[PDB]
Design a protein around this motif. Structure first.
Motif, mmCIF file in Angstrom:
data_model
loop_
_atom_site.group_PDB
_atom_site.id
_atom_site.type_symbol
_atom_site.label_atom_id
_atom_site.label_comp_id
_atom_site.label_asym_id
_atom_site.label_seq_id
_atom_site.Cartn_x
_atom_site.Cartn_y
_atom_site.Cartn_z
ATOM 1 N N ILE A 64 2.215 5.407 3.736
ATOM 2 C CA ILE A 64 2.093 3.880 4.365
ATOM 3 C C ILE A 64 3.042 3.322 3.595
ATOM 4 O O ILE A 64 3.281 3.668 2.272
ATOM 5 C CB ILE A 64 0.729 3.773 4.064
ATOM 6 C CG1 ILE A 64 -0.282 4.429 5.053
ATOM 7 C CG2 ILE A 64 0.499 2.006 4.101
ATOM 8 C CD1 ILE A 64 -1.773 4.153 4.384
ATOM 9 N N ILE A 65 3.542 2.105 4.057
ATOM 10 C CA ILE A 65 4.559 1.155 3.212
ATOM 11 C C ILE A 65 3.822 -0.241 3.481
ATOM 12 O O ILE A 65 3.595 -0.480 4.579
ATOM 13 C CB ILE A 65 5.873 1.260 3.623
ATOM 14 C CG1 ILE A 65 6.220 1.082 4.913
ATOM 15 C CG2 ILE A 65 6.602 2.835 3.038
ATOM 16 C CD1 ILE A 65 7.676 0.418 5.090
ATOM 17 N N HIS A 90 4.738 1.803 -1.727
ATOM 18 C CA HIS A 90 4.579 3.080 -0.926
ATOM 19 C C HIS A 90 3.172 3.803 -1.434
ATOM 20 O O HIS A 90 2.833 3.679 -2.532
ATOM 21 C CB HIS A 90 5.693 3.874 -1.399
ATOM 22 C CG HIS A 90 7.142 3.738 -0.871
ATOM 23 N ND1 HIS A 90 7.701 4.584 0.116
ATOM 24 C CD2 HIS A 90 7.878 2.892 -1.115
ATOM 25 C CE1 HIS A 90 8.939 3.876 0.490
ATOM 26 N NE2 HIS A 90 8.902 2.765 -0.414
ATOM 27 N N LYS A 95 8.953 -3.441 -0.667
ATOM 28 C CA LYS A 95 7.755 -2.500 -0.129
ATOM 29 C C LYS A 95 7.192 -2.040 -1.138
ATOM 30 O O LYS A 95 7.949 -1.563 -2.067
ATOM 31 C CB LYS A 95 8.039 -1.769 0.992
ATOM 32 C CG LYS A 95 9.473 -0.960 0.709
ATOM 33 C CD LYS A 95 9.672 0.193 1.663
ATOM 34 C CE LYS A 95 11.082 0.928 1.676
ATOM 35 N NZ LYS A 95 11.353 1.162 0.124
ATOM 36 N N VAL A 123 2.319 0.937 8.731
ATOM 37 C CA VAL A 123 3.349 -0.097 7.884
ATOM 38 C C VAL A 123 1.994 -1.288 7.708
ATOM 39 O O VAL A 123 1.549 -1.766 8.860
ATOM 40 C CB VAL A 123 4.274 -0.582 8.817
ATOM 41 C CG1 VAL A 123 4.749 -1.767 8.233
ATOM 42 C CG2 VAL A 123 5.526 0.516 8.681
ATOM 43 N N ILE A 124 2.104 -1.708 6.508
ATOM 44 C CA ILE A 124 1.109 -3.010 6.316
ATOM 45 C C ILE A 124 2.084 -4.068 6.062
ATOM 46 O O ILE A 124 3.227 -4.016 5.185
ATOM 47 C CB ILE A 124 0.318 -2.717 4.880
ATOM 48 C CG1 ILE A 124 -0.796 -1.630 5.246
ATOM 49 C CG2 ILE A 124 -0.589 -4.070 4.774
ATOM 50 C CD1 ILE A 124 -1.426 -1.176 3.847
#
Ligand SMILES: CNc1cc(N2CCC[C@@](O)(CNC(=O)c3ccc(CN4CCC(C)(C)CC4)cc3O)C2)ncn1
Lengths: 201, 236
Positions: A86-87, A107, A105, A127-128
């Motif tokens: 996830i980033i 990780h 970002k 992706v957040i």
């Protein structure tokens, strides 16, 4: 017991076998990477008894800098395969992005152990986009993603802080306020292992 | 507002809602650029040592099977002898995809003598159209390009709309980031295509339709007094 629970402790020394098994583990470790908090050495990180915490489920491991590599080592040493990453894209309130490159970002590695059944894989994307509310905090969106992935199951967070306590989660960290346990299975094993309430050695 | 919840409700990816001049530097780069050079070569059968001189930057874009709803496995990629053509001080940009490449690509970098200094994420929006590998936990909406270094302005993000299916091109923005680092003028793009040929770059790949590569002509671009230029300085 659904409501938030936590244990102030040195995670190096807590006997985590008293806590049972969890569908999801999340850790935001204080990797040793000039920081305003105490850290754990690479060896202390490797030696954490993560393996007792799950039989089948997922691990979420925040990493930065060279912990992108050390975190992968730990993940594999603890018996996980890394299956997603996830980033979190950091924005301001107007939804704009906040060594060789500036960093936009953070990780979070996603590891799997065993063969989890009944999880809702593929509901969320990796992706957040969320505002940096306070520095050093992780985005609350991760808890919702994890809850939709695995609704109602027991979860445990390592190296969390008081703002991290959440229903369905047990939070461990050395800046939490005392011990607050409601699950009777956990209370029973805690009293057995720690009859005088102290967590040493 | 929770854009993860919003994506679950609507199918709009959270990245759909993301909203000095530095142009004379771009002109210096443009002036310093060597002529584009390119060579059709089947890289599995081709001895990369014939590619000289040793490169300051390598952009490596192996065609991964995940890119397709001849493919290169990480077994193939790992066995390339990249260290034989990289300069003692040099850089690599490895497109790793979104699955096992994020791990195997790091093994490769270390195998070839690099350490990773950046992780550049290509985040793909779906504004215009609001798969699932079996091991995937989440929908994969990005690709990673790892930056490696060996020896002694921009952001680590590229945001564009997801290309049409079957289009495997990577964002041209990656070239802008690389060229803005001013790393030297010997730049190699392995597995490039006719569509990626670019001034300042040597492009080598199996699908090129034409070649103009000559090792002596190419080396002549960097003979003295131009051996150590960064590619961001004036002509000598
Ligand atoms: C010695 N044995 C210990 C030590 C111990 N801690 C040491 C002191 C602090 C604390 O108490 C609470 N944790 C943090 O403040 C904390 C802060 C920042 C970060 C870095 N992140 C990077 C990714 C992100 C930006 C998304 C979010 C930030 C991680 C943290 O973990 C945990 N806890 C139990 N046992």
């Amino acid at each position: 017991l659904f409501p938030p629970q936590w244990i102030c402790c040195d995670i190096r020394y807590l006997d985590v076998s008293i806590l049972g098994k969890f569908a999801v583990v999340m850790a935001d470790p204080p990797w040793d990477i000039e920081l305003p908090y105490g850290t754990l050495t690479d060896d202390e990180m490797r030696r954490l008894n993560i393996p007792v915490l799950q039989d089948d489920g997922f691990l979420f491991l925040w990493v930065t800098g060279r912990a992108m590599e050390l975190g992968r080592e730990c993940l594999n040493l603890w018996g996980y395969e890394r299956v997603d990453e996830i980033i979190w894209v950091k924005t301001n309130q107007l939804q704009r992005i906040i060594h060789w490159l500036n960093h936009g970002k953070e990780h979070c590695l996603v590891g799997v152990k065993g063969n989890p059944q009944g999880f809702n894989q593929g509901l969320d994307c990796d992706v957040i986009v969320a505002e940096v509310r306070s520095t050093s905090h992780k985005p609350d969106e991760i808890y919702g993603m994890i809850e939709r992935l695995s609704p109602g199951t027991r979860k445990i967070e390592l190296f969390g802080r008081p703002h991290n306590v959440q229903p369905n989660w047990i939070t461990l960290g050395n800046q939490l306020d005392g011990i607050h346990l409601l699950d009777p299975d956990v209370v029973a094993r805690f009293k057995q292992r720690y009859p005088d309430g102290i967590i040493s050695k | 507002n929770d854009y993860c919840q919003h994506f679950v409700d609507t199918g709009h990816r959270p990245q759909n809602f993301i909203r000095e001049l530095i142009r004379l530097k771009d002109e210096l780069i443009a002036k310093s650029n060597t002529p584009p050079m390119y060579l059709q070569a089947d890289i599995e059968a081709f001895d990369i040592r014939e590619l000289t001189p040793k490169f300051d930057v390598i952009l490596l874009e192996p065609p991964l099977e995940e890119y397709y709803r001849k493919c290169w496995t990480w077994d193939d990629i790992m066995k390339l002898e990249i260290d034989e053509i990289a300069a003692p001080r040099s850089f690599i940009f490895l497109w790793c995809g979104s699955g096992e490449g994020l791990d195997l690509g790091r093994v490769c970098l270390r195998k070839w003598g690099y350490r990773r200094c950046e992780d550049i994420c290509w985040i793909k929006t779906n504004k215009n159209n609001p798969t699932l590998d079996p091991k995937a936990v989440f929908q994969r909406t990005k690709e990673h390009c790892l930056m490696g270094i060996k020896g002694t302005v921009d952001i680590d993000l590229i945001i564009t709309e997801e290309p049409e299916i079957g289009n495997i091109e990577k964002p041209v923005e990656i070239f802008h980031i690389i060229e803005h680092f001013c790393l030297g003028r010997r730049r190699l793009h392995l597995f490039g295509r006719d569509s990626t040929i670019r001034p300042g770059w040597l492009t080598v790949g199996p699908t090129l339709t034409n070649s103009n590569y000559n090792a002596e002509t190419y080396a002549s671009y960097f003979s003295a007094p131009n051996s150590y230029l960064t590619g961001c300085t004036e002509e000598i």
